[PDB]
Every structure is written in structure tokens, then in C-alpha cells.
């Protein structure tokens, strides 16, 4: 009826305003905070005026016409987003499509730094404005963040400041919390970007297959009917969020959380905890829920999926069902596999049937089908064991450095900040996954690599530089990791010209936190590879150890700058000799 009334009634003023603030920040990432808050109140007012009189003018326009109209009222649009004004000429959905495409995955804004005194200050004098700002800062940095999940984090962030602002020593309560939360924002953001990237680049059918694999591992006791239903509904939730439809996305999400809690007995014993919780906790808890124990009545699969003579007839009849069922069954018994491994096994199952059923004796052919999955399984298992050995041997920083070398060799045309960001994210896959019980390491590692590879692809979408990267990013979602693992030193590379200043250090580096010192060195390392692509990881490890030693020394000196100045250029030249 009035779609905007309806959502307002369903969501209530607070959340309504929340999600409307996020939406606007993510669509207009540059606008001062004040204008968004203003645009938000205006829509909220119209919403209220509509809830009271659904028959009133323009109350029956769709949401996107309404928000699209509000965004296009914003002043200096053509100075702030010269590229956006254009979308404003268009109708809907054309208009929305246009804003979407214009979203910025790397607006490269200032780092959100916890200034606890000035933040506790700002919080006390106005809690609503302080939290609203938080949503804006985060939304505009992560224009595809899972809308409703941000309202959830903003609660945590509120609890953070509520506990630490009266607390004794302020920063030491608050700074480990805000760092922890930031880590969760970044992972959360990555998980969602992969979902939306999957919608954009591979379509729903791919998003559903992913979801079937995953939800079956999590809910191995639910039947297939029940899995299909949730996947159907969840896909619709994320489709909407990814399309910028946040109010509908949230409303649909609450519906699904309620469905799931009505049925937790047919779904999972692990939901109990989640279901006893308030709305936003509940959804978050369901979203992040752990895998239930395997039922003791899992069916052998030989019979229907390898022995049956009718398989061909069954498969031809309705492929997507028979295959979905296969995927449901294989995944439910394999929480020890990664989602992409499962999706790879499903394409091989499928590929094997396409093949065998075309042959004169399909049953003699498809009978060994499960034995084709073996190589699929051991390849990633050994790749994880290998990288976990290396990691436990050399620790995060060196593991990252090995990854930054590996990736700069694979894609030397990518900018150093990106190679560094990625190599660093990749290395944190080790820290996270390698310490886990052994059978969890494969799924952790690959599911996490998916997130980081997709981040590389996303950046690469805005700034394309390498064809090998394009190919891996666009070929097959399921083959993405194996496609990247397979790249080697790009042989067509032309060593970047040497530029002394790049590798020249100064005293300023001395008062950066460790975290930031590393990035400085790690950038130099990428630069070392670009200029000398053929040097082995071992030569680079040694040369960088020298650079590290030189920095420690000079920063420790009475005269830091004469140290850097006298020692640097010598180390700069001799180090090229070691990279021959
Ligand atoms: C309902 O059966 C399916 C449907 C689509 C799929 C897609 C993929 C990967 C993600 C792809 O690259 O398209 C894998 C397995 C699938 C099984
Ligand atoms: C368990 O820890 C890891 C961490 C990073 C990894 C990166 C890669 C990439 C895809 C590569 O190109 O080799 C593979 C495996 C990995 C396992």
C-alpha cells in the first residue's frame, strides 16, 4: 500500500532511521554527516505522515523513488559526485542501478582511530548523534556492509562506550574493545562483499548453491525441504541488501529469524541459545551459529547417487533438484570441507553425469563417480598443511612477507598498497585457521581465502591492471582459489625502473606503532619484488632482514637522521646486488 508506512510500522522509528542512515552513507560516501542526518529526518517525517494517512500524495511511490528522490535533492551533488548527477536524470530502477555502480569500494578515507577522551566527551553530550556518526563512518567505508548487522555492531559499540567512559583507566578498557570490533567489522564486511560480488558476477543460482552447501554443513539434521526454504529466503534477504533495499532486507531478515526459531527442533539444537535473545542478537547469533552434530542416521549415498540405474532419467528430468539434493547430502556430512571444495565436488558430480549418461552404458560409467572427488580433496588439504607448517615456523609477519612476495610475483602490476593489504589479509588466514583443531583448518582456510581473494577482485574491478587477475576473478567462483594458487611469476613483466627514494628511510618511521612500521617495510618489500621480480623468496627475506636491522639501529640512535642518512644509501645499493 504505502511501502514506506509499512516498513516504518514493521521496523519502528529507531531501526527505520538506522537503516535509512546506512543506505544514504553507502550511496553517498563523501557527504558531510550533517546532510545525511538531515536527509534522514526528512524521509522519516514523510514516513510518519504516510503511516497516519496512507492515502496522502506520494505515499504510494516505491521506496527507491522516494530515497532516490531524496538523494538527488542533496546540494553540490555535481561538485561532490559529478559522476552521480547523471543517475538523477534517470527513472527507477535505472536510477538505482546507476547509483549502485557508482559505489566506491576503496574510497580510501581516514582510518577510524579511537580518540577515547574526545569520544567519551562527544558520547556523553549526545549519545544518538555519536552512534549515528558511527553508522555513517562505517557504512560509507563499506558501501556493501550487511545493513542490519551494522545496527547490531553499533549496539556493541554503544555497550563499549557505556562500559568504558565511567571506567577507571579509560583507554585500556576501551582501546582493546574498539580494535576487536574493528576486526569484526572488517571480517563481517568481507563476508558480505563476497555475497554481493557473487550476486553481481555469477548470479543467484551460484549464490544459492553456495548457501545450500554452507547451510547443510551447519544444519546437518534439517531435512532438504527445510534447507531449501531457508536458503530461498536468505538469498532473497541478501539480494535485497546487495541491491540497496535495506528496509525490506531487514524486515525479511526478521521474518526469517522468526521462521527459524519456530522450527529449531527440525533445524538445529544449536539454535536454542540464539533463540532466547533479542531481535538483533538473535539474527546475528543465527547468522554466526556453529555447526550441529551429525545425525546418526545419515544415509549411505552410493545407492541413489552411484548405483541406481535411473540416475540419467532422474538427472535429465530435473537437474537442479537432483543436483541440489546431492549437494545437500554431501555437504551435510562434510563440515570438514570448505564450501568451495563442496561446490567443486558438485560440479564434478554433475560433469560426470553429463558425460556418462551420454555414453552407451551410463551405469558402468557413473559407478566410480565418488572416486573422482579424491584428488579434489587432497589438493587443498596439502596446500593448507604446507602453509600452516610455514606459518607456525616463521610467525605472522614473515608469513605475510612470503605472501606479499608470492602475490607481487603473480601480479606485479597491482599497486603496492593493495599487494600489501592483500598479503597481510592472506597471512591473517594463517593466524586464525592454523591454530584450530586439525579437521577445522581446511574449511576455515579456504572460506577465509575466498573473502580475501574477492577483496582483491573487487579492488581489481575498480582499477584493472592485470589480465591474469581478470581471468581468475571472472572464470568460476568455485575455481577462484585454485586459479590464483596456480599463477606464477608473470613472465611478461618488465621490471619496474629502480628509484632510490622508494627504498630510502628516515627517522619519522621511528614513532609509528609496530603495525604501521611493518606496512612501511612490507611496502618496500613489494617494491623490491617489482624492481627485481626474479629474486627468490630467500634472497628477499635476507635483504629485508637487513632493512629491518638498519631501521632498528637508526631509530635507536642519538642522532636518528644522520644514522639513516649515512647508512641508508650504502644498504640501498648493496641490497640490489643480493637480489640478482
Ligand atoms: C543446484 O546445483 C548447482 C548450481 C549452481 C552451481 C554453481 C557452482 C559454482 C559457484 C560456479 O562457478 O558457478 C557450483 C555448484 C553448483 C551447483
Ligand atoms: C592456512 O593458511 C593459508 C594462508 C594463506 C594462503 C594463501 C594461498 C594462496 C591462495 C596462494 O596463492 O597460494 C593458499 C593457501 C593459504 C593458506
- Number of residues assigned to the chain: 580
How many angstroms separate the alpha carbon of residue 258 from the centre of ligand 2? 38
Residue 380 to residues 127, 279, 344, 386, 399, Cα–Cα distance (Å): 48, 38, 11, 10, 18
Judge if the beta carbon of residue 280 lies within 6 A of ligand 1: no
Q: Does residue 449 contact residue 478 with C-beta atoms inside 8 Å?
A: no
Alpha-carbon gap, residue 403 to 125, rounded angstroms: 46
Give the alpha-carbon dihedral of 12, 17, 19, 25, to 10 degrees: 180
- Closest residue by CA, ligand 1 atom 3: 209
Return all residues near 375 (Cβ < 8 A) that are at least 6 apart.
none
- Closest residue by CA, ligand 1 atom 4: 209
Grid cell, residue 497, equals: 625502473
Q: How was this structure determined?
A: X-ray
Q: What is the DSSP letter of 496?
A: P
- Closest residue by CA, ligand 1 atom 16: 209
The data reach a resolution, in angstroms, of: 2.4
Judge if the beta carbon of residue 481 lies within 6 A of ligand 2: yes
Closest approach atom of ligand 2 to CA 481: 10
Return all residues near 120 (Cβ < 8 A) that are at least 6 apart.
161, 164, 165, 170, 174
Domain 293-378: give its CATH architecture: Orthogonal Bundle (1.10)
Grid cell, residue 301, equals: 549415498
Judge if the beta carbon of residue 324 lies within 6 A of ligand 1: yes
How many angstroms separate the alpha carbon of residue 515 from the centre of ligand 1? 40
Alpha-carbon gap, residue 18 to 3, rounded angstroms: 17
Has domain 379-490 been given CATH number 1.10.246.10?
Answer: yes
For a substitution probing ligand 2, which of 419, 485, 488, 489 has the most ligand atoms within 8 Å of its CB?
Answer: 485
| Helix or strand (DSSP H, E) at 439 | none
Closest approach atom of ligand 1 to CA 324: 1
Q: Does residue 340 contact residue 443 with C-beta atoms inside 8 Å?
A: no
Q: Does residue 281 contact residue 156 with C-beta atoms inside 8 Å?
A: no
Grid cell, residue 433, equals: 585457521
Q: Which CATH class is domain 491-568?
A: mainly alpha
* CATH topology for the 105-193 domain: Serum Albumin; Chain A, Domain 1 (1.10.246)
Alpha-carbon gap, residue 174 to 62, rounded angstroms: 42
3-state secondary structure of 488: coil
Alpha-carbon gap, residue 50 to 37, rounded angstroms: 20
Binning the chain into helix, strand and coil, the percentages to the nearest 5 are 75, 0, 25
* Domain positions in the chain: 1-104, 105-193, 201-292, 293-378, 379-490, 491-568
Report which of 254, 194, 287, 212 is spatially closest to residue 10, judged by C-alpha positions: 254
Return all residues near 128 (Cβ < 8 A) that are at least 6 apart.
none
Closest approach atom of ligand 1 to CA 198: 10
Judge if the beta carbon of residue 205 lies within 6 A of ligand 1: yes
How many angstroms separate the alpha carbon of residue 427 from the centre of ligand 1? 28
- Closest residue by CA, ligand 2 atom 7: 426
SS (H, E, C) 261-322: HHCHHHHCCCHHHHHCCCHHHHHHHHHCCCCCCCCCCCCCCHHHHHHCCCHHHHHHHCHHHH
Residue 329 to residues 301, 346, 418, 513, Cα–Cα distance (Å): 8, 11, 39, 49
- Closest residue by CA, ligand 2 atom 2: 430
Residue carrying C-alpha cell 541491491: 243
Report which bound ligand comes closest to the CA of 343: 1
Q: What is the DSSP letter of 498?
A: P
Closest approach atom of ligand 1 to CA 212: 1
Note whether 379-490 and 491-568 share their fold: yes
How many angstroms separate the alpha carbon of residue 347 from the centre of ligand 1? 7
Q: Does residue 394 contact residue 388 with C-beta atoms inside 8 Å?
A: no
How many angstroms separate the alpha carbon of residue 77 from the centre of ligand 2? 43
- Measured from the Cβ of residue 481, the count of other Cβ atoms closer than 10 Å reads 22
Which alpha helices (DSSP H) does 85-220 contain, by range? 94-101, 116-125, 127-141, 147-164, 171-202, 204-218
Known binding residues for Ca(2+) are 3, 10, 240, 245, 248, 251, 255
Output the DSSP codes for 185-242.
Answer: HHHHHHHHHHHHHHHHHH-HHHHHHHHHHHHHHH-TTS-HHHHHHHHHHHHHHHHHHH
Closest approach atom of ligand 2 to CA 410: 12
Return all residues near 395 (Cβ < 8 A) that are at least 6 apart.
none
Q: What is the DSSP letter of 115?
A: -
Residue carrying C-alpha cell 535429465: 316
Residue carrying C-alpha cell 553507502: 26
- Closest residue by CA, ligand 2 atom 5: 426
Closest approach atom of ligand 1 to CA 477: 12
Has domain 1-104 been given CATH number 1.10.246.10?
Answer: yes
Alpha-carbon gap, residue 534 to 397, rounded angstroms: 22
Alpha-carbon gap, residue 530 to 573, rounded angstroms: 16
- Measured from the Cβ of residue 540, the count of other Cβ atoms closer than 10 Å reads 24
How many angstroms separate the alpha carbon of residue 205 from the centre of ligand 1? 7
Return all residues near 303 (Cβ < 8 A) that are at least 6 apart.
none
3-state secondary structure of 82: coil
Known binding residues are 3, 10, 64, 240, 243, 245, 248, 251, 255
Alpha-carbon gap, residue 92 to 64, rounded angstroms: 7
Judge if the beta carbon of residue 194 lies within 6 A of ligand 1: no
- CATH code, residues 201-292: 1.10.246.10
Alpha-carbon gap, residue 416 to 114, rounded angstroms: 26
Judge if the beta carbon of residue 387 lies within 6 A of ligand 2: yes
Report which bound ligand comes closest to the CA of 475: 1
Q: Does residue 516 contact residue 556 with C-beta atoms inside 8 Å?
A: no
Return all residues near 580 (Cβ < 8 A) that are at least 6 apart.
532, 535
The answer, yes or no, to whether the previous bond of 557 is cis (omega within 30 of 0) is: no
Q: Does residue 539 contact residue 578 with C-beta atoms inside 8 Å?
A: yes
Grid cell, residue 121, equals: 566527551
Report which of 321, 315, 310, 377 is spatially closest to residue 345, judged by C-alpha positions: 377
Q: Does residue 345 contact residue 373 with C-beta atoms inside 8 Å?
A: yes
Largest CA distance in the chain: 84
- Closest residue by CA, ligand 2 atom 11: 485
Judge if the beta carbon of residue 148 lies within 6 A of ligand 2: no
φ, ψ at 34 (rounded to 5°): -50, -50
Using only C-alpha atoms, the chain has a radius of gyration, in whole angstroms, of: 27
How many angstroms separate the alpha carbon of residue 384 from the centre of ligand 2? 7
Amino acid at each position: 500500500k504505502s511501502e514506506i508506512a509499512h516498513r516504518f510500522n514493521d521496523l519502528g522509528e529507531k531501526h527505520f532511521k538506522g537503516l535509512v542512515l546506512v543506505a544514504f552513507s553507502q550511496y553517498l560516501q563523501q557527504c558531510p554527516f550533517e546532510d545525511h542526518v538531515k536527509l534522514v529526518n526528512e524521509v522519516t517525517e514523510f514516513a510518519k505522515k504516510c503511516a497516519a494517512d496512507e492515502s496522502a500524495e506520494n505515499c504510494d511511490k516505491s521506496l527507491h523513488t522516494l530515497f532516490g528522490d531524496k538523494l538527488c535533492t542533496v546540494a553540490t551533488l555535481r561538485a561532490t559526485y559529478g559522476e552521480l548527477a547523471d543517475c538523477c536524470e534517470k527513472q527507477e530502477p535505472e536510477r538505482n542501478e546507476c547509483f549502485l555502480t557508482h559505489k566506491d569500494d576503496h574510497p580510501n578515507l581516514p582510518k577510524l582511530k579511537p580518540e577515547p577522551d574526545a569520544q567519551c566527551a562527544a558520547f556523553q553530550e549526545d549519545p544518538d548523534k555519536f552512534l549515528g556518526k558511527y553508522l555513517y563512518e562505517v557504512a560509507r567505508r563499506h558501501p556493501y556492509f550487511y545493513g542490519p548487522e551494522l545496527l547490531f555492531h553499533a549496539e556493541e559499540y554503544k555497550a563499549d562506550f557505556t562500559e568504558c567512559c565511567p571506567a577507571d583507566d579509560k583507554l585500556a578498557c576501551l582501546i582493546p574493545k574498539l580494535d576487536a570490533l574493528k576486526e569484526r567489522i572488517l571480517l563481517s564486511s568481507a563476508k558480505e562483499r563476497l555475497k554481493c560480488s557473487s550476486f553481481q558476477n555469477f548470479g543467484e543460482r551460484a549464490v544459492k548453491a553456495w548457501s545450500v552447501a554452507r547451510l547443510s554443513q551447519k544444519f546437518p539434521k534439517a531435512d532438504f525441504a527445510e534447507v531449501s526454504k531457508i536458503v530461498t529466503d536468505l538469498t532473497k534477504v541478501h539480494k535485497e541488501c546487495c541491491h540497496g533495499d535495506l528496509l525490506e532486507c531487514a524486515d525479511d531478515r526478521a521474518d526469517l529469524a522468526k521462521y527459524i526459531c519456530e522450527h529449531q527442533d527440525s533445524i538445529s539444537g544449536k539454535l536454542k541459545a540464539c533463540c532466547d535473545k533479542p531481535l538483533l542478537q538473535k539474527s546475528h547469533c543465527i547468522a554466526e551459529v556453529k555447526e550441529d552434530d551429525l545425525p546418526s542416521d545419515l544415509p549411505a549415498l552410493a545407492a541413489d547417487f552411484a548405483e541406481d540405474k535411473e540416475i540419467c532419467k532422474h538427472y535429465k528430468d530435473a537437474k537442479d533438484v537432483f543436483l541440489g539434493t546431492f549437494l545437500y547430502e554431501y555437504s551435510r556430512r562434510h563440515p570438514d570441507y570448505s564450501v568451495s571444495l563442496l561446490l567443486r565436488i558438485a560440479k564434478t558430480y554433475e560433469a560426470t553425469l553429463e558425460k556418462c549418461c551420454a555414453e552407451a552404458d551410463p551405469p558402468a560409467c557413473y559407478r566410480t563417480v565418488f572416486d573422482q572427488f579424491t584428488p579434489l580433496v587432497e589438493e587443498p588439504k596439502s596446500l593448507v598443511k604446507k602453509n600452516c607448517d610455514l606459518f607456525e615456523e616463521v610467525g605472522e609477519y614473515d608469513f605475510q612477507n612470503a605472501l606479499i612476495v608470492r602475490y607481487t610475483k603473480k601480479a606485479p602490476q597491482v599497486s603496492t598498497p593493495t599487494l600489501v593489504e592483500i598479503g597481510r589479509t592472506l597471512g591473517k588466514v594463517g593466524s586464525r585457521c592454523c591454530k584450530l583443531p586439525e579437521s577445522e583448518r581446511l574449511p576455515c582456510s579456504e572460506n577465509h581465502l575466498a573473502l580475501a581473494l574477492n577483496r582483491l577482485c573487487v579492488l581489481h574491478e575498480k582499477t584493472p591492471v592485470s589480465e591474469k587477475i581478470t581471468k581468475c576473478c571472472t572464470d568460476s567462483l568455485a575455481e577462484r582459489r585454485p586459479c590464483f594458487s596456480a599463477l606464477e611469476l608473470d613472465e611478461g613483466y618488465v621490471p619496474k625502473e629502480f628509484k632510490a627514494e622508494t627504498f630510502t628511510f628516515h627517522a619519522d618511521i621511528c614513532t609509528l606503532p609496530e603495525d604501521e612500521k611493518q606496512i612501511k617495510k612490507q611496502s618496500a618489500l613489494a617494491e623490491l619484488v617489482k624492481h627485481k621480480p626474479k629474486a627468490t623468496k630467500e634472497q628477499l627475506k635476507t635483504v629485508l632482514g637487513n632493512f629491518s636491522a638498519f631501521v632498528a639501529k637508526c631509530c635507536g640512535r642519538e642522532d636518528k637522521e644522520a644514522c639513516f642518512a649515512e647508512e641508508g644509501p650504502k644498504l640501498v645499493a648493496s641490497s640490489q646486488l643480493a637480489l640478482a
